[PDB]
Ligand binder design. Structure first.
Ligand SMILES: CCN(CC)c1ccc2c(c1)Oc1cc(N(CC)CC)ccc1C2c1ccccc1C(=O)OCCOCCn1cc(CO[C@@H]2O[C@@H](C)[C@@H](O)[C@@H](O)[C@@H]2O)nn1
Ligand SMILES: CCN(CC)c1ccc2c(c1)Oc1cc(N(CC)CC)ccc1C2c1ccccc1C(=O)OCCOCCn1cc(CO[C@@H]2O[C@@H](C)[C@@H](O)[C@@H](O)[C@@H]2O)nn1
Length: 266
């Protein structure tokens, strides 16, 4: 099927969805009044994205996988340009997260059954300590004040949660113990986490609200899943993108059940 990645920002919100199809990545954007086609058009078979607000200006980084490299593509208000990211890979699935306004970035790559990590601290790219088995990776992160926490979901036999608390990596209380493709989001400082798994054409949901994992009401057909969420005061909003072949369907949580969203690819 096509493979998607989703970021959002502000409270309207704005959404960017990236779809990899026949080696091309294209962008559908939402401004609060209709979906439209963004400038982004780069080569790639797989995509992940992350973004951050500097005051009220969005900065977007798309990690596009092209055989023996992943290229970073940068939006900073005035067009797409190539980023300082470099890797060396084999015919590659990535997950990205970022935090603060510096910002800091962590990119996880599953290459031939191993997940590895590249980190950006504002000075340059370096190799992170993370290195664990997996064919499939998703990531979410949250600030507790100025301390970053990172939850990596590595799917190989079992999906394993790997938690970073700022001084070491450990196995988390998640494990839903073939060919799982996961997408993760989180919100607040508890935090809440939702992990979506495409397995055998069903997408299903696992939930953390600080007091143990449980199966969520989310249940929709798809072979690929991406997700983004945003808070408005105390209210969470989620957009899940479920894909089968070239058909991507949006599912929205606005606090009153999962409903089909307006998203089209066109
Ligand atoms: C574009 C081509 N690439 C990528 C392959 C590249 C370019 C330069 C270097 C490169 C690689 O590697 C090294 C390595 C060394 N070392 C140890 C590190 C051994 C001697 C030394 C020099 C180079 C240098 C280097 C040599 C001499 C002088 C300066 C540098 C340098 O600027 O370095 C790169 C970062 O410096 C400032 C340039 N830069 C890049 C950005 C990017 O900011 C954007 O936004 C960020 C948030 C990220 O998304 C980021 O990826 C994105 O591009 N901001 N500033
Ligand atoms: C207080 C002692 N008792 C017996 C009286 C008890 C104990 C645990 C639960 C209990 C009750 O109830 C639930 C109920 C659910 N529901 C509601 C029917 C969702 C399927 C889930 C887990 C337990 C859980 C639960 C089970 C296992 C692990 C943790 C919890 C838990 O955090 O328990 C307390 C927190 O539970 C969350 C309550 N709830 C409902 C929703 C809204 O929906 C969820 O969140 C949305 C944002 C979406 O992701 C949606 O798909 C997803 O299902 N969010 N939270």
């Amino acid at each position: 099927s096509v493979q998607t990645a989703a970021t959002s920002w502000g409270t309207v919100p704005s959404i960017a969805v990236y779809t990899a199809n026949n080696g091309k990545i294209t962008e559908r954007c939402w401004d609060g009044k209709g979906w439209y086609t963004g400038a982004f058009n780069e080569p790639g078979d797989n995509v992940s994205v992350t973004s951050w607000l500097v005051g009220s200006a969005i900065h977007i980084r798309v990690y596009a996988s092209t055989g023996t490299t992943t290229t970073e593509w940068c939006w900073d208000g005035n067009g797409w340009t190539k980023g300082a990211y470099t890797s060396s890979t084999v015919p590659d699935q990535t997950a990205a997260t970022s935090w603060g306004t510096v910002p800091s970035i962590a990119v996880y790559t599953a290459n031939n059954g191993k997940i590895t990590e590249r980190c950006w601290d504002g000075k340059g790219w370096y190799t992170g300590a993370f290195n664990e088995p997996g064919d499939n990776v998703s990531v979410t992160s949250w600030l507790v004040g100025s301390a970053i926490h990172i939850a990596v979901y590595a799917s190989t036999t079992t999906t394993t949660e790997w938690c970073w608390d700022g001084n070491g990596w450990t196995k988390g209380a998640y494990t839903s113990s073939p060919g799982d493709q996961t997408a993760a989001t989180s919100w607040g400082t508890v935090p809440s986490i939702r992990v979506y798994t495409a397995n055998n054409g069903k997408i299903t949901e696992r939930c953390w609200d600080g007091k143990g994992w449980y199966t969520g009401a989310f249940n929709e057909p798809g072979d690929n899943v991406s997700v983004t969420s945003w808070l408005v005061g105390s209210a969470i909003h989620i957009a899940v993108y479920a894909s089968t072949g070239t058909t991507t369907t949006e599912w929205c949580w606005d606090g009153n059940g999962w409903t089909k969203g307006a998203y089209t690819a066109t």
